[PDB]
Amino acid sequence: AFTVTVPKDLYVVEYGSNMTIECKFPVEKQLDLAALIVYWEMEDKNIIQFVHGEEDLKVQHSSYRQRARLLKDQLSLGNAALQITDVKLQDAGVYRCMISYGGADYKRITVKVNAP
After folding, report:
1. Are the CB atoms for 46 and 38 separated by under 8 Å?
2. Structurally, how many domains does the chain consist of?
3. What whole-number distance in Å separates Cα of residue 45 and Cα of residue 63?
4. How would DSSP label each residue in the chain?
5. How many whole angstroms separate alpha carbon 87 and alpha carbon 25?
6. Which domain holds residue 61?
7. How far apart, in whole angstroms, are the C-alpha atoms of residue 76 and residue 68?
8. What are the residues facing 46 on neighbouring strands?
9. Residue 3 is assigned to a structural domain of this protein
10. Phi, psi of 34 (to 5 degrees)
11. Which of 24, 38, 45, 116 could join 50 in a cystine, given CB atoms 3.0 to 4.6 angstroms apart?
12. Contact 99, 27 (CB under 8 A)
């Protein structure tokens, strides 16, 4: 069965530093962009909506604009890493990594932001 794995389910970050949360899914021999769907969220805010090789920055939440990017250099390695810059207190919460690639699964990651 298709399975999504996360090496860490809890991230502790400093105020104002950068953070890259990892989320892995199996890729065998090559990546078919037409069959991959990646979705990142927190609470109910849209962060990443990567549907068949394209992203839509209009549906993205305003709180993560110009601060969030999906590292495409590791999608071929089976790593859909979400990087958020200049972490603020509002970035603390439970993040969900939902991936659809020849199957479906999702995982949770808890992020705690230290006070400045």
Report:
1. no
2. 1
3. 8
4. ----B-S-SEEEE-TT--EEE--B----SS--GGG-EEEEEETTEEEEEEETTEE-SSSS-GGGTTTEEE-GGGTTTTB--EEESS--GGG-EEEEEEEESSSEEEEEEEEEE---
5. 26
6. 10-113
7. 19
8. 41
9. no
10. -75, -15
11. 38
12. no
On whether residue 5 sits in a domain, the answer given is no
Distance CA 9, CA 95 (A): 9
| Per-residue burial over 10-21, b = 16 or more CB atoms within 10 Å of its CB, e = otherwise | ebebeeeeebeb
CATH no. for residue 29? Answer: 2.60.40.10
Distances (CA, A) of 45 to 41, 66, 100, 114: 6, 15, 19, 21
| Resolution of this structure in Å | 3.2
The rounded Cα 15 to chain-centroid distance in angstroms is 20
Chain centroid to Cα 74, Å, comes to 12
Sign of CA dihedral 27, 29, 30, 32: negative
Q: Which residues of 62-84 are buried (b: 16+ CB within 10 A; e: fewer)?
A: eebeeebebeeeebeebbbbbeb
95 — phi, psi (to 5°)? -100, 150
Method: X-ray
